[PDB]
Amino acid sequence: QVTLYGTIKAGVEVSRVKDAGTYKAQGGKSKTATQIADFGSKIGFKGQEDLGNGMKAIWQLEQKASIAGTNSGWGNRQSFIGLKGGFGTVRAGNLNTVLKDSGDNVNAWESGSNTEDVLGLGTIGRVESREISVRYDSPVFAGFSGSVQYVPRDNANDVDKYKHTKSSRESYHAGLKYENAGFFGQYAGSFAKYADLNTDAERVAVNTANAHPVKDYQVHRVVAGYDANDLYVSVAGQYEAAKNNEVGSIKGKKHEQTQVAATAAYRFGNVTPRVSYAHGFKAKVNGVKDANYQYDQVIVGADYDFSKRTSALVSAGWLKQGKGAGKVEQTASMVGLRHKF
Ligand SMILES: [Cs+]
Ligand SMILES: [Cs+]
Ligand SMILES: [Cs+]
């Protein structure tokens, strides 16, 4: 058995930015942008084969396939080969991170790439990635499951494979989840002894232009709530910390940020109204308070389910980043359609 699957999703987004620094027009306000945008349409192929003993071969090849014609590539969304059995599941390939998977219970919103941070809880998801890795996922037992995942040094830095001149960027990913009676709680995190961040505090490839080497890179996320009975509520707490590891005056000093997020939704027949709030507290950068990283956002909207596979989508969002006259405000709304096949 071999299956074709995917999601086609798109809409029109209206957005405005209030940034004193970049816009001379009155009040620091940009013009209003109106755009047809793909929301992340994708297409996949997957299969499994019973090997006879409660064991199965599994594989998946998933790709970005925006209906705007902007992606190219195979295997650039989660794609793997593995084996599943009484023992649980083992997979190797371009795999979601345990943090990336936990992101499903944090940020349910659909948007284009341009509005990811205002029509979605983009910022909290900055720690989420796909990685060339191996992963183990346990069976569920007494409502408990866990995952363990690893990125090899020579996958994190191909160039240095034979010369171990740069310190290793290998990383560890792990998670622990409990479901019972509509209640859920999970822990997800990662650790990298050495890593590299851009200024937005996403991880980037070693030797990327303006990458900032760090050491002791750790992320911790806790999410909890209730999902059942037409009611959805969740709350997430995230902690990110590292040491400056770039050679210079600031080497060894502490970076850190705490983020939180909350979503609630109710199902009214075919309509699901939803609201989300998130907050980034002031970061510590080289051991000093930095309110450029602080943010506050709120998103409201609704899905209308024409069918189990097809929804109309609407949302509106209001985001504030930084403090004072350096601050950026983004407002946006969209309307959209989603079809899962
Ligand atoms: Cs998205
Ligand atoms: Cs991300
Ligand atoms: Cs990556």
Side-chain angles (χ1 to χ4, degrees):
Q1 174 225 0
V2 168
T3 108
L4 160 68
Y5 71 94
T7 299
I8 307 300
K9 53 174 161 196
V12 345
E13 321 173 299
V14 172
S15 66
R16 182 182 261 253
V17 173
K18 197 192 157 173
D19 174 5
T22 58
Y23 304 102
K24 110 153 201 271
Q26 54 170 301
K29 284 158 201 162
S30 69
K31 272 94 189 299
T32 297
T34 311
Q35 278 196 318
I36 296 170
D38 185 79
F39 291 182
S41 291
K42 38 144 179 287
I43 192 169
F45 306 88
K46 62 187 174 178
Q48 63 179 69
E49 175 183 39
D50 166 40
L51 303 180
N53 349 315
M55 190 132 43
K56 303 201 269 206
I58 65 181
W59 65 277
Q60 166 165 300
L61 238 200
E62 202 175 296
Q63 296 47 69
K64 300 179 205 178
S66 156
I67 65 179
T70 58
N71 297 125
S72 65
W74 293 88
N76 56 8
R77 308 197 17 110
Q78 177 157 265
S79 302
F80 53 77
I81 194 154
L83 296 160
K84 198 168 187 110
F87 64 84
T89 300
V90 64
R91 294 180 283 170
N94 189 199
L95 294 169
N96 289 358
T97 243
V98 173
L99 264 157
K100 191 169 195 337
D101 289 322
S102 71
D104 293 328
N105 295 100
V106 182
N107 178 30
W109 301 97
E110 299 296 10
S111 64
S113 64
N114 188 51
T115 53
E116 265 186 313
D117 300 328
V118 54
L119 297 180
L121 302 178
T123 309
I124 203 174
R126 79 194 176 193
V127 296
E128 294 173 16
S129 72
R130 266 179 234 105
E131 302 297 339
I132 306 316
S133 43
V134 285
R135 179 163 157 172
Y136 170 67
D137 306 281
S138 83
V140 182
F141 174 70
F144 277 123
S145 25
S147 306
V148 123
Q149 171 175 30
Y150 178 76
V151 187
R153 167 171 210 173
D154 307 328
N155 286 284
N157 186 11
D158 176 80
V159 137
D160 196 49
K161 252 181 283 176
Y162 285 130
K163 293 148 177 267
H164 280 319
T165 74
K166 294 265 202 166
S167 340
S168 178
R169 266 54 170 175
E170 73 199 73
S171 63
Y172 291 91
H173 302 76
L176 193 73
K177 189 179 202 199
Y178 179 81
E179 290 159 309
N180 166 11
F183 290 88
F184 69 92
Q186 62 183 323
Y187 162 87
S190 54
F191 180 78
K193 187 67 198 181
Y194 298 92
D196 306 277
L197 276 33
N198 55 27
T199 36
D200 287 345
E202 299 165 301
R203 227 157 38 263
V204 293
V206 199
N207 318 314
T208 263
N210 321 124
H212 312 277
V214 301
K215 164 183 204 154
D216 293 328
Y217 183 59
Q218 54 176 329
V219 179
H220 292 95
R221 182 191 275 178
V222 164
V223 201
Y226 183 87
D227 179 358
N229 258 89
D230 281 358
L231 170 59
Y232 182 80
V233 71
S234 93
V235 308
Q238 184 163 109
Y239 180 72
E240 294 150 71
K243 302 216 195 75
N244 180 313
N245 194 52
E246 170 137 7
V247 19
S249 67
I250 48 192
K251 197 171 195 214
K253 280 157 193 210
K254 229 295 171 316
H255 310 313
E256 89 193 350
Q257 194 175 10
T258 278
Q259 309 197 231
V260 291
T263 300
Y266 291 84
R267 155 137 258 148
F268 297 96
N270 279 320
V271 192
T272 307
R274 191 168 48 261
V275 62
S276 286
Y277 168 85
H279 181 76
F281 297 94
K282 297 181 227 276
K284 181 150 95 177
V285 191
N286 302 311
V288 140
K289 207 108 63 173
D290 196 344
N292 289 310
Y293 293 93
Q294 157 181 94
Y295 73 89
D296 254 304
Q297 80 181 303
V298 56
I299 304 169
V300 295
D303 301 2
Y304 181 96
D305 295 335
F306 286 113
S307 70
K308 271 179 211 160
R309 295 197 315 140
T310 301
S311 325
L313 298 172
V314 306
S315 72
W318 290 273
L319 168 72
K320 290 203 217 159
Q321 291 161 129
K323 206 176 202 75
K327 86 152 62 224
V328 160
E329 292 184 13
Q330 295 179 55
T331 50
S333 59
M334 70 78 183
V335 68
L337 202 56
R338 170 182 67 214
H339 180 71
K340 304 184 194 216
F341 66 95

